[PDB]
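User: Hey, quick favor. My workstation is busy. Could you predict this chain's structure for me?
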Amino acid sequence: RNLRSMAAQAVEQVVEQGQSLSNILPPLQQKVSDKDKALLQELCFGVLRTLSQLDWLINKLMARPMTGKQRTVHYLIMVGLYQLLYTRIPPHAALAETVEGAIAIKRPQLKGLINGVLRQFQRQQEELLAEFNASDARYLHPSWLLKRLQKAYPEQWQSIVEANNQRPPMWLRINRTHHSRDSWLALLDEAGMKGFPHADYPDAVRLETPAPVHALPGFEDGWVTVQDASAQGCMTWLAPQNGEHILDLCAAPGGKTTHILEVAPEAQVVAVDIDEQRLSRVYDNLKRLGMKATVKQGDGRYPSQWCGEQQFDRILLDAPCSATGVIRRHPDIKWLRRDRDIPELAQLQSEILDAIWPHLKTGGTLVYATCSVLPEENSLQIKAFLQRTADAELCETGTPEQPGKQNLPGAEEGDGFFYAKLIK
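Assistant: No problem, here it is.
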C-alpha cells in the first residue's frame, strides 16, 4: 500500500474533518509492518507538527491550492514536502512515492501536477526557506494560539513554542511496590538502555531515546508505566492514603489511577470517565499492575448519575481542557482546537467543578489539574471557583492571588501542566 496516501488522508481528516489522530491512526497502523508503521507515524505526526510551514510553502508555490474535490491532493503534496524537508529519504524516491500516492487517493490524473509542484519546490527551496525563517509561521503555531502564548508569556513564549515543537521525551513511572527508581534504572542499564531521574518527580525516569513498551523491563509485570512527568506530579499534591475513598475523575487512560495505588495500595479508588472507549484503557492499566478499583462510566457534569449522593475523601480532577501543554506529543491539538474553544472549555471546567465539589467530604482534598498552559483554564479558573465557593480553600499550590502551579514543557521536563490543590 502507499504510505504517503495513507498519511495524506489521515492528516486531511484531522485538519478538515476534526478527527483525532489517536482515533484515525490505529486502524491504519494495524495494516502495516513495523518499519512502515514507523514511517506512517513519522509522516502523520510530522506533517501535523510542521503544517504551518508546509501550508506556507504551498501558498508560495501554487497560485491556486488544491481544494474541494481535490483537497486530498493538497495534503499529499504537503506529505511530499515533509519528506524533502525533514527526512533523509532520497528525494527522487520521496517524489516517486508521493506521486504514486495519487492512485490510492483516487486522483491518478494529478500525478503530473504533484510531481510538478514538488519539483518546483526543489527548484526554489533555497529562497523559500530563507524567506520562511523570517516569518511568524516559523514558530509552527496557528496565529490564534501563538498570540495567546505571546500574551500569557511575554518573556517565555519563544521557549514554549520551541519546546512544543521538539520531539517529546519518553517519560516512565517506576512502580515503587516492585522496585525503587534507582533499582529499576540499574535493570534498564543492564538492558542496554539509558535513563535519567528528575529531582522533582521521584518515580520518574526519562529515556534518552524512546523505546517500544515491550522493551521496558517488566512492563507486562507492572514494573513501569509510560506517563509524562508532569502528570506524575499530581501525586505530590493528591497525597493519597490507605483506606481512603478517592475519586479519579476523567481517569482515562488510568495512569494516575494506578499511581494513587502505588502510593497507597489500600485506597478505595473509583475511576470514572465518559465512554466505554476510554474505559478499556483504565481496565488494562489496573489489570497489568495487579490492582483493583471500581471503574464507572460517567459524566462529571452530573455526578449523581453514577455515584448517587456519595462523598469522597480526595478527588483528582484531570479537567477536560485545551491540552495546549501536550502539543509536543499531539501536534493535532494545534489544528483541532480553535480560539473559540478556550472560553467553552473554561466554562465546562467551571461547570464540572461546581457539580463535583458537593461530592467532596468535609475536610477532603480536591486536586484540579489540566494539561493546558492557558491562564483562563488554570490560575484564573481556580480563582473564579474560590470566589463563588465559600467552603473552598487553596492549599500550597500558588496563592489566593494566583492560584495553582504552572509547568512549562522542555526537553528534560514534563508537559505543560497545571496543579491546584483545594480543601473544604
